[model samples]
Structures are given as C-alpha cells and as structure tokens.
Target: QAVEYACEKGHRFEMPFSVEAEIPPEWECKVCGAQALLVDGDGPEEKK
Candidate 1:
C-alpha cells in the first residue's frame, strides 16, 4: 500500500508502506525539497 503526502507548496506524492513499518509525521518533498505532511490526516503533531 501507499501513503499520500503534501508539502507547504502543495506538492503531492505517495510512499510505499508495510504493516510493520512506521509512518513518519513529515517527509521531504521530492519536487521542492521542502517539508511535507501526510495528506490522509494521520501522523505526529506538535502540542499547542
């Protein structure tokens, strides 16, 4: 399966995943080399 991610610049991409794998909260955007977040609404978040 795959997970979708979007960056601050709106760059979208998918990453492959396995059941035993850990999904990181942020990923580097391949197009712009910026920080990206999971589009599916799941991942780590900072405390307010």
Candidate 2:
C-alpha cells in the first residue's frame, strides 16, 4: 500500500523520508500479491 501510495503521490527516493505501516503476516498486497503492512491510527498526533 505504501509503495502504491508513494507511486501515486509521485514520491521518489530523493524525497523526504516517511515511515510506512508495519507489515502484517496475513495481509497481501493488492497490486503485486505480496505482503502488505497494516497502518493503525489509534492515538493523537502530538505528544503531551
């Protein structure tokens, strides 16, 4: 998903780095049938 998103966004290796979600054991990539990572949004964006 990350790779797809990045490709869609026109992001390359020269662009700013961003961390993608963690790879899960069961989920498969929708584009390449490879393993995919699950992104979780569970908390606030800022630390208190």
Candidate 3:
C-alpha cells in the first residue's frame, strides 16, 4: 500500500509501503520542499 502526506503548503504525495516498511510521522515534501506530515488514517485502524 501507499501512504499519504501533505506539507504546510498543502503539497500532497504518496510513498509505497509494505509489511517490512516503516512509516514515519513526517517526510520531505515533493512540491514545496518543506517538511511533510503523515495523513491521518494511514496507520492501524481500530474498530470496536
């Protein structure tokens, strides 16, 4: 699967991930070149 991220400038991008992949809280932006934040809901989803 792929993870979504957006920078302060609202630049969004995605990076591929697998079972062995480690998703970081933040990554580099592809547009503004600033720090990007991991979008919500990409992590484990808990249901009760």
Candidate 4:
C-alpha cells in the first residue's frame, strides 16, 4: 500500500510501504526541506 505524508507548511506526498516494513524515520519535505510527517499524525516536529 501507499502511505501519504505532509510537510509542516501543508505540502503533501505519497510513498510505497508494506506491513512488515518500518514506518520510516522521516520523509524529506518536497516543499520546504521540513521532513514530512505521516498524515496519520505520528511523526517528527518542526524542522526549524
């Protein structure tokens, strides 16, 4: 399945994933270099 992510500035994107795989540490923000967060609401804080 695919996991969707969003940057702090409201940027959104998607990534491929599997059940047995790690949810990932972070996703580089495509819009602001602010590591994107899972739209699920469990991820990193502001990048500065």
Candidate closest to the true structure, highest lDDT: 3
Assess the local accuracy of residue 44 in candidate 3 as a C-alpha lDDT between 0 and 100: 34
RMSD of each: 6.0, 10.4, 4.2, 7.3
Candidate 2 segments exceeding 4 Å error = 1-26, 41-48
Q: Evaluate residue 26 in candidate 1 and report its C-alpha lDDT on the 0 to 100 scale.
A: 78
For model 3, the stretches where C-alpha displacement exceeds 4 angstroms are 41-48
Q: Please write out the lDDT profile of model 4 over residues 1-48, one tens digit for every residue.
A: 466778887888776665445566568886677978776523322211
Error of 2 at 28 (Å): 0.6
> Where does the lowest 10-residue lDDT sum fall in candidate 1?
39-48
Tens digit per residue, CA lDDT, model 3, 1-48: 567778999777876655344567788887777999877534532110
Model 1, 1-48: lDDT tens digits are 467778898788876765344567678887688899866534322110
The count of residue-pair clashes in candidate 1 stands at: 0
Q: Report residue 12 deviation for candidate 3 (angstroms).
A: 1.3
TM-score, per-candidate, Cα-based: 0.64, 0.27, 0.64, 0.54
lDDT value, residue 6 of candidate 4: 81
Candidate 1 regions with alpha-carbon error over 4 angstroms: 41-48
State the lDDT at 40 in candidate 2.
36
